Amino acid sequence: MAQSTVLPMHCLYGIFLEGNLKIQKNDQEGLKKFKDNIKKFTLELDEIDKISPQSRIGGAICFSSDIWDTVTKKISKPKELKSVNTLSSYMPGTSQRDILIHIISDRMDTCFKLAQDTMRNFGEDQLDIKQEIHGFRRVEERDLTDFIDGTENPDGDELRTQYGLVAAGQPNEFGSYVFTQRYVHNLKKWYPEPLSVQQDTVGRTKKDSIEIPRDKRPITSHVSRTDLSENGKDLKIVRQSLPYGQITGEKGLMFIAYACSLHNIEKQLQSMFGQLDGKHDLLLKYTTPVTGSFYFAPSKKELLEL
Amino acid sequence: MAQSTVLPMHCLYGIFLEGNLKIQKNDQEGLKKFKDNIKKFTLELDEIDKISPQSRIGGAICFSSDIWDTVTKKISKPKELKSVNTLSSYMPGTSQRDILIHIISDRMDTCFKLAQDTMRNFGEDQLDIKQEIHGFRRVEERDLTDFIDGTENPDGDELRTQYGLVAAGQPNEFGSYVFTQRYVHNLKKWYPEPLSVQQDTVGRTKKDSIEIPRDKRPITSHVSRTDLSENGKDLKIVRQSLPYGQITGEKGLMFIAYACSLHNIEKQLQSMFGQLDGKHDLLLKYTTPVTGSFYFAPSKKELLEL
Ligand code: HEM
Ligand code: HEM
Ligand SMILES: [Zn+2]
Ligand SMILES: [Zn+2]
C-alpha cells in the first residue's frame, strides 16, 4: 500500500528529481493535468515492473508541507511535516523543494526510462527541477569513504514497515516522511587519514563493518551520533542513500531516509549538527551537505486521491 | 590479442576518461611509474572479469600521435595516426587529448570500480583529465533521438575484427584507431519535428529501424552520409557510442568508433561535415559536437611493451 521506494533493499541505481511545483492551487486545468501525470507515473511503474522484473523498479512522488495545500484539498496534511529550512540556523545546505521524484532500479535503463518519461509528461510548465542526481551502488555497497554503507539499515519487510512507514490505523497510514540531503565529499582530506582515525570517525571497522563498541568509540563518531533511542525505542530510519558523482570532479553521497516519523530523522540531524550536546559529527570534517528537503510520500491510495 | 573494447557488443555502461599525459619523455622514474599503472590496469581488468563474469568488463588505454613518442621508444607509431585538430577548419568541437581510458561493462559498479581505481593509481601527477563521461545504454538501445542506435554496426567477432582491428601481419596488428566525439543534443528542436522529417534526417524508420532505401532518402540523411564505400570496400567502423547526460540538463551521445584504419572514420567525418560534396549531415541541425580526439589502442602485447 506504500509507494515502492521504502521496503525494497539493495537497489543498484537511483534517480533523484527535486524541484518546485509551478501550478497554482486555483488552476484547476493545470492541477487536473498534474494529477493525470501522477496517475501515468503509477501506471508506468507497474508496466516496467511487468516487462522487466529484473529491474525491481521502485518509485515515489513526495510532497513538502509548503505545497500540500496546493495539490490536495481532501487529504489532511501529515502532522509532523514542515520545511527543512527551519533547521537553517544550525544545519547548512538547506534548500526545501516542493516535490521529490525518487526512482530506484537494478538497471539504469529502466530507471532512466521512468525518470525521463515522467519528466516529459510533467514538463517545464509543471515542474522546475532544481536538482537531478544519478545515484549508483558501488562494489560491496561501499560509500566513497570506502566504508560499507547500510549495515544496520533495518532489514526485511517487517522492520522497514515499522520504522519506515506511518503505522496502520493512523492518519496518512502507509505514507512515509522523507529527508534528502546531497553531500559533497572532501576525499583529499579523507584519504590521508590513518585507518584508526577513519574508523574513529565512523564507529565501525573499514574492512568488515564491525561495530566498534560504543564504550570504545568517540561520542562524536558517526554511529554514536545517529544510533539513537528515546524512551527505550530505537529511532531507526530506512536509508536509500547512494553514491554519485565524477571520479575527477564533484562526488559524494546522495542521502535519503524514509521514516514512520519525521522526528526520527530530525533528532539525528540535531545530534549530528551539535543541537543536542554542542558537538558535531566527526564525519562532517570530510563531507559537506549542500542541499536538503523534507517531504512526505503518501500511500499509493492517498497519492491517487489527492 | 586486442584490448577488450572493440569486439564485445551491447555494453550497458561505458566510462570515458580523456586527458593529457603530464609525464615528460625524459622522466624515466615517472615513465616507469606510468607503465606500472598500465600493467595494473590490465591486471585489474582480468581480476574483475574473473570475479564478475556478468559484467562482461572491457577496457582500453589509447594514445594520440602527439604523445606516442613520449610513451614508447620501441613501438613504431601507427602510420595513419594524427591529431584530430587538423580537421578544425571544417569540423567544430575538436579537442585532441593525449590519452583515452575507455571502460565498458554490463554493471555500473564494476565499470566505476575499474575507472576509479585506475585514476587513483595514475593520479593528478600523471593524468590531467579534461573529460569524464558516464555513458549508459537506454531501453531498446535507442539514442536520445529515440531512434535505435547500432543496427548496421558490424555484428560478430569476424566482422568486428575485419573492420575494427588492424589486420594480422601488419605493423601494430590487433590495435585499433579510435575516434571520440561528445555530442550535445538540441531535443527542443528535435521533438517537434514530424515523424517524416525525423526519418528523413536519419534514413531509417523510428519504430523498427528499417533502412529507408537509399533511392528514397536524402543524400544528406545520416545513413547516406555515413554508409560509405571506396573501391568496392565498405568503410565500416565499430561504434561503442552510448547516451549520456541529465534529463533536465545537458545530454546527448558520447560517440566512439574503433576502426582498422583511421581513414574509415575520417572519410565519414568528411562526408558528414561537407568536405566531400559541400553538404552537411541533416542530423547536425539537432546535435552539436563539442569534443573530439583521435587515438590508437595498441594490442594487448604492444600496450605492455611500450
Ligand atoms: C556523507 C554523509 C553520510 C555518510 C558518508 C554516511 C555513512 C554511513 C556509514 C558508513 C554507516 C555504517 C553503518 C551502517 O550503514 O549501518 C552509517 C550508518 C548510519 N547512518 Fe550515516 N552517513 C551519512 C549521513 C547520514 C545522515 C545525514 C543520517 C541521518 C540523518 C545518517 C544516519 C545513519 C544511521 C541511522 C546509521 C545506522 C546507525 C545504527 O543504528 O547503527 N547518516 N552511515
Ligand atoms: C549525435 C551524433 C550521432 C547520432 C545521434 C547517431 C545516430 C545513428 C543512428 C540512429 C544510426 C542508425 C543505424 C545504425 O545504427 O546502424 C546510425 C548509424 C551509423 N552512424 Fe551515426 N550517429 C551519430 C554520429 C555518428 C558519427 C560521428 C559517425 C562517424 C564518424 C557515425 C557513423 C555511423 C555509421 C557508419 C552508421 C551505420 C551506417 C550504415 O552502414 O548503415 N555516426 N547513427
Ligand atoms: Zn524526541
Ligand atoms: Zn579514401
Author numbering:
A (entry chain A), B (entry chain A): 1 to 306
From the manuscript:
The Dictyostelium discoideum dye-decolorizing peroxidase (DdDyP) is a newly discovered peroxidase, which belongs to a unique class of heme peroxidase family that lacks homology to the known members of plant peroxidase superfamily. The overall architecture of DdDyP is similar to that of the typical DyP-type peroxidase superfamily. DdDyP contains a duplicated ferredoxin-like fold domain arranged as a β-barrel at the N- and C-terminals of the protein.
Moreover, the crystal unit cell exhibited significantly shorter axes, giving rise to about 35% smaller cell volume with 52.8% solvent content and 2.62 Å3 Da−1 of Matthew’s coefficient (V m), indicating the presence of a single molecule per asymmetric unit. Our structural analysis shows that the native DdDyP heme is hexacoordinated, of which the pyrrole rings of porphyrin contributed to tetradentate chelation via their nitrogen atoms and via the conserved His222 at the proximal side with a distance of 2.11 Å. Wat-184 forms a strong hydrogen bond (∼2.2 Å) with wat-182 and a weaker hydrogen bond with the catalytic residue Arg239. On the other hand, wat-182 interacts via strong hydrogen bonds with the second catalytic residue Asp149 as well as Ser241, suggesting that these residues may act as proton acceptors to the H2O2 during the formation of compound I oxyferryl thereby contributing to its stabilization along with Arg239 as revealed in other A-type DyP peroxidases.
